[PDB]
Structures are given as C-alpha cells and as structure tokens.
Amino acid sequence: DLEERFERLYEKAKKLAEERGDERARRMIELLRQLFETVGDPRILELLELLLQLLEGLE
C-alpha cells in the first residue's frame, strides 16, 4: 500500500529531522505529507525518500 509506505517513511524522516534540530527540514516533511494526502502522486513519495537520503548524508 502506498499510504502505509508513506507513513512509515514520514515517521522516519520526521524523527531524523527532530534529532538534528533541522527546523527547515521538519517543515518540508510536513508539506510533503500534506501534498501527498492531497494529490497522492508517487513522485511525492520519491521526494521524501530523497530528502531523507539528503539528511542521512549529513550524519
């Protein structure tokens, strides 16, 4: 399911952004969730995956 996969990814990305204190990333993650709930486009899932990879690259 696309929604269940997005929610798991959202919690993982939000958790990392909070650990880093990255307020800008936190707001991007919330916007991505709002857009995915509105549109449902799988490209929004890919965007969040790439944002998570970007944050993981900073660790």
CSV table of C-alpha atoms in Angstrom, one decimal:
chain,number,residue,atom,x,y,z
A,1,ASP,CA,0.0,0.0,0.0
A,2,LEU,CA,1.3,3.5,-0.9
A,3,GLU,CA,-0.2,5.2,2.1
A,4,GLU,CA,1.2,2.8,4.6
A,5,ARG,CA,4.6,3.0,3.0
A,6,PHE,CA,4.5,6.8,3.0
A,7,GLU,CA,3.5,7.0,6.7
A,8,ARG,CA,6.4,4.7,7.7
A,9,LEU,CA,8.8,6.9,5.6
A,10,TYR,CA,7.3,10.1,7.1
A,11,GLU,CA,7.9,9.0,10.7
A,12,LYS,CA,11.5,8.0,9.9
A,13,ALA,CA,12.2,11.4,8.2
A,14,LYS,CA,10.5,13.4,10.9
A,15,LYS,CA,12.4,11.5,13.6
A,16,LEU,CA,15.8,12.3,11.9
A,17,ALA,CA,15.0,16.0,11.4
A,18,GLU,CA,14.0,16.4,15.0
A,19,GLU,CA,17.2,14.7,16.2
A,20,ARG,CA,19.3,17.1,14.1
A,21,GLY,CA,17.2,20.2,15.1
A,22,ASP,CA,16.6,20.9,11.4
A,23,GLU,CA,13.5,23.1,11.5
A,24,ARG,CA,13.6,23.7,7.8
A,25,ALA,CA,13.6,20.0,7.0
A,26,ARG,CA,10.8,19.4,9.5
A,27,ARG,CA,8.6,21.9,7.7
A,28,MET,CA,9.4,20.4,4.3
A,29,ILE,CA,8.5,17.0,5.6
A,30,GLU,CA,5.1,18.3,6.9
A,31,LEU,CA,4.5,20.0,3.5
A,32,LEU,CA,5.3,16.7,1.7
A,33,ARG,CA,2.8,14.8,3.8
A,34,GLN,CA,0.1,17.5,3.1
A,35,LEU,CA,0.8,17.3,-0.6
A,36,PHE,CA,0.7,13.5,-0.7
A,37,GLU,CA,-2.6,13.4,1.2
A,38,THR,CA,-4.0,16.0,-1.3
A,39,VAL,CA,-2.6,14.6,-4.6
A,40,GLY,CA,-1.4,11.0,-3.9
A,41,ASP,CA,1.3,11.2,-6.6
A,42,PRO,CA,4.1,8.6,-6.1
A,43,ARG,CA,6.6,11.3,-7.1
A,44,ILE,CA,5.9,12.9,-3.7
A,45,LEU,CA,6.9,9.7,-2.0
A,46,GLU,CA,10.2,9.8,-4.1
A,47,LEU,CA,10.7,13.4,-3.0
A,48,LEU,CA,10.5,12.4,0.7
A,49,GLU,CA,12.8,9.5,0.1
A,50,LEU,CA,15.4,11.8,-1.5
A,51,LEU,CA,15.0,14.3,1.4
A,52,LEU,CA,15.6,11.5,3.9
A,53,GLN,CA,18.7,10.4,2.0
A,54,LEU,CA,20.0,14.0,2.0
A,55,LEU,CA,19.6,14.2,5.8
A,56,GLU,CA,21.2,10.8,6.2
A,57,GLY,CA,24.2,12.0,4.1
A,58,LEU,CA,24.8,14.8,6.7
A,59,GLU,CA,25.2,12.2,9.6
